[PDB]
Design an enzyme around this catalytic site. Sequence first.
Site, short mmCIF file in Angstrom:
data_model
loop_
_atom_site.label_atom_id
_atom_site.label_comp_id
_atom_site.label_asym_id
_atom_site.label_seq_id
_atom_site.Cartn_x
_atom_site.Cartn_y
_atom_site.Cartn_z
N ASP A 122 0.83 -1.20 0.00
CA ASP A 122 0.00 0.00 0.00
C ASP A 122 0.87 1.25 0.00
O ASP A 122 1.37 1.68 1.06
CB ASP A 122 -0.90 -0.03 1.22
CG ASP A 122 -1.82 1.16 1.29
OD1 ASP A 122 -1.90 1.89 0.29
OD2 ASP A 122 -2.46 1.35 2.35
N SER B 14 -0.69 15.55 -12.11
CA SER B 14 -0.94 15.20 -13.50
C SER B 14 -1.19 16.45 -14.32
O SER B 14 -1.74 17.44 -13.84
CB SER B 14 -2.16 14.28 -13.58
OG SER B 14 -2.51 13.99 -14.92
#
Length: 330
Positions: A35, A199
Amino acid sequence: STGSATTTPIDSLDDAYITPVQIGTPAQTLNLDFDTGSSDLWVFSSETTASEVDGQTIYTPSKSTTAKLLSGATWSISYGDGSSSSGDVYTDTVSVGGLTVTGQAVESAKKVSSSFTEDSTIDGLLGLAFSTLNTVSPTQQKTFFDNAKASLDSPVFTADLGYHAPGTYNFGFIDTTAYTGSITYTAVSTKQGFWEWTSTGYAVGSGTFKSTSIDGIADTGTTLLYLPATVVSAYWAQVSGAKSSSSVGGYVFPCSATLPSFTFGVGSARIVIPGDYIDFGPISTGSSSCFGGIQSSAGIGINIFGDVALKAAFVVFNGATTPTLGFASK
């Protein structure tokens, strides 16, 4: 040193991936959920409330000659999905794919929430976010990667998750045969303890690319792709009959639909998520309504590049003094 381990989907939907981890002496192999959105290595154990164990493999520290109770240390965590767990702490030897750390904090669960009990395939979590998020008290503990970093050939790990197939976690090296083209690196903020990046935009299907900054986290422990409501609405508007269902808890779509791809930007580069990766199947057995793999982050507080996005790429988690993220197509 290096390590290399195969990671395997737990079910036919890629709801999560498990990776075998050797703990203790002799080794006890548990299948952990790696994770990158959390920083605790915790396991089902001989100390877990018996009614809360249902098929998981447990770590028994009393059978490990290298286990040592970390006196006074406790841990307690709550995840973004509402699940939780807590317990006490041992140090022990932990190996992943041939890479060994001695003295790793292994957090033994005394209590786990129902969602963990109900998932017999996941024996615990191995956190790979920054150690500032580790929950051990009164002395915070380091992640497996932080403990191994100095010994690694290069201070990196890579995630290469498969679509409906096994993939690989590598530590200490970049497998140049595992991706196409070049790796595009992008800046990381560690201010929230995550692999947080920006992004450069998105496209839906064959549509034009929209240049817009989307801050979010690279999170292998989250199944889906969570993005701003504007972006998510633009995606599902291209699927006839798709709608947001408050009763189901997100966007659903007719199982008869063909889904368009979704592209996200990494600098000037582009990662394409095929439409099929966005299908999470019937909302209940036999239903013709299917659950979407791109969902709104509006109720989270952060955008999450979970497995839906990451499995479309070869992803480098560069843990140099100034961390960065790398993405390549594959």
